[PDB]
């Protein structure tokens, strides 16, 4: 019945003014990539930074179980593209946002599927 809610805790810690998780592993890349959110190799475009996925996963970084009956990690072993404007807090960004299942872009940061 009792489960630690790590996601909520980071969110509240951030709103309380706490410093975001650091030492996310930023990759060197061309920044001419597809811009999709989570990829097998860095795919940042001109407006993004690419990061090693494990280092941007709240569950990986805080040594807690993954929110998944399988415990499978969405980010470990992959690269996550983060908008440059949000790259001071990749863990926050990945937690607070969601990937369009059709085009693979971040909803609100690349996904255009909801356009006329």
């Amino acid at each position: 019945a009792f489960a630690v809610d790590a996601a909520k805790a980071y969110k509240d810690y951030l709103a309380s003014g706490g410093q975001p998780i650091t030492n996310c592993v930023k990759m060197l890349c061309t920044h001419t990539g597809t811009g999709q959110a989570i990829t097998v190799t860095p795919e940042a475009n001109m407006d993004q930074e690419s990061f090693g996925g494990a280092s941007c996963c709240l569950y990986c970084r805080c040594h807690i179980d993954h929110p998944n009956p399988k415990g499978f990690c969405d980010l470990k072993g992959k690269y996550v593209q983060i908008p440059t404007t949000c790259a001071n807090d990749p863990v926050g960004f990945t937690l607070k946002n969601t990937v369009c299942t059709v085009c693979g872009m971040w909803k609100g940061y690349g996904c255009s599927c909801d356009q006329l």
Binding site: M27, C29, G53, H63, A87
Partner: protein
């Protein structure tokens, strides 16, 4: 320069051929630092440059390639070097990493513990080690060949590196091993490669290219480390991050190098020649299974 636009500098062949005596390493650029791109870690830059240099060698790159990376953790609890290796290597490459201390990684599997506890059933196509004990950097005592994890690495290479495979093992002025240099003579080619981002340090990666499983050349490792220090002492390397800004050709080309199982009797000179050219890997293609030995103790009463 020209050198400043390369990923780093490899030890020129003539320095390998000397018979120098070991001296203290005194680097002119000691204390210089390269200007890293914004927000990029030293370890990401260093591994990027290592991989850029490895792109210029005749690495064997089979389907279902197997790579193991020792010393992969950081005091930060992450694995920047692993993240670069996985970007570099073809998608699908099996990547295992390890460190004495806990860390989270993008590797397919991670083992925490002293490297001497690590065992694998299978052979590997590439071994990378950044393992280092900063207590070796003590200038008040004599600089002898070191054992420890280097003894493990030497055995691991001879027992678990596929013929045709390659290694890159980090050394410094004081972190080195004579048998490891000697084992460089069991590859078709070898060098000591210094990254341009960390050129102010006596660090180098000892690279053995295309393993042959037997000595092609007899190397005295005490002499060769003295030769390496002599080179470093007399050839200042300009700190440079220039190569980090061009990643268009970074990925390791998937060559689909052939993998064959072969018994010792079948390694003729035509096989040895293919091995030496980066055109063949000899090992089993079974499943990759690893383990870490755990010492059990009960300290109650």
């Amino acid at each position: 320069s020209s050198q400043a636009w390369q990923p780093g500098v490899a030890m020129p062949n003539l320095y390998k051929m000397q018979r120098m005596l070991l001296e203290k390493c005194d680097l002119q650029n000691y204390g210089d630092s390269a200007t890293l791109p914004k927000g990029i870690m030293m370890n990401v830059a260093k591994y990027t440059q290592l991989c850029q240099y490895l792109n210029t060698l005749t690495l064997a790159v089979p389907y279902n390639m197997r790579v193991i990376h020792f010393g992969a953790g950081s005091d930060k609890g992450v694995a920047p070097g692993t993240a670069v290796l996985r970007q570099w290597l073809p998608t699908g490459t099996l990547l295992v990493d390890s460190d004495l201390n806990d860390f989270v990684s993008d590797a397919d599997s991670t083992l925490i513990g002293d490297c001497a506890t690590v065992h694998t059933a299978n052979k590997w196509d590439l071994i990378i080690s950044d393992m280092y004990d900063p207590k070796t950097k003590n200038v008040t005592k004599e600089n002898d060949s070191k054992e420890g994890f280097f003894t493990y690495i030497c055995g691991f290479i001879q027992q678990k590196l596929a013929l045709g495979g390659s290694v890159a093992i980090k050394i410094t002025e004081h972190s080195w091993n004579a048998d490891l240099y000697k084992l460089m003579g069991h590859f078709a080619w070898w060098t000591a490669f210094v990254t341009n981002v960390n050129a102010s340090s006596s660090e180098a990666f000892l690279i053995g290219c295309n393993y042959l499983g037997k000595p092609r050349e007899q190397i005295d490792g005490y002499v060769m480390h003295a030769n390496y220090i002599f080179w470093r002492n007399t050839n200042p390397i300009q700190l440079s991050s220039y190569s980090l800004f061009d990643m268009s050709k970074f990925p390791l080309k998937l060559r689909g190098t052939a993998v064959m199982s072969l018994k010792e009797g079948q390694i003729n000179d035509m096989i040895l020649s293919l091995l030496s050219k980066g055109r063949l890997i000899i090992r089993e293609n079974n499943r990759v299974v690893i383990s870490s030995d755990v010492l059990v103790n009960n300290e109650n009463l």
